[PDB]
Assembly symmetry: C2
């Protein structure tokens, strides 16, 4: 049998993508990190979706992605939304939490 790690499906494609990221961002990736591991996992599964011509779950999985990557910004967005609901007394589309999260990420760097 062939070890899974030795099934070299798209190994050189993956390496090309990483080189593009490293050149463009002018850094070296941390192959140890959760962010890198999840990036590679995302790419591997995106390859599968592309091969099968599958769409994605546009709204809902964006939420969880941001909750996992930027929990402080994500939860802060929801705290702002809580206050908006309490004062303005209108419903809030969860897309607003996505926008707020993205606007918060740069603030404390």
């Amino acid at each position: 049998l062939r070890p899974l790690s030795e099934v070299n499906q798209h190994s050189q494609l993956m390496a090309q993508l990483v080189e593009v990221i490293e050149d463009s961002f002018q850094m070296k990736v941390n192959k140890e990190s959760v962010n890198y591991l999840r990036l590679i996992r995302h790419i591997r599964f995106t390859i599968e979706r592309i091969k099968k011509e599958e769409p994605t779950k546009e709204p809902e999985k964006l939420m969880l992605l941001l909750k996992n990557e930027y929990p402080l910004c994500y939860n802060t967005a929801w705290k702002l939304i809580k206050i908006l609901q309490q004062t303005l007394k209108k419903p809030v589309h969860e897309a607003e939490a996505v926008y707020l999260t993205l606007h918060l990420i740069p603030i404390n760097q």
Copy 2:
């Protein structure tokens, strides 16, 4: 106007990030403008088209990550010989933000 509301929202941000926002900075201006658009869309009960809106937000706020995501998507398309949907550029951008920053 929502002046007191805005001040409370900024206080929450400051607490959560354990920082004080410089009120005499582009940082504060950008923040308050975005928040005011959120308020306006909530009050007027106006939905967004999240796919198109996110592409616009990312292009303008995360140009390096977004443009790099598009380069990667083009490589994937050309290698796999399949269509790639615009939403993929969005999801890939969101995975790149924490790599770059």
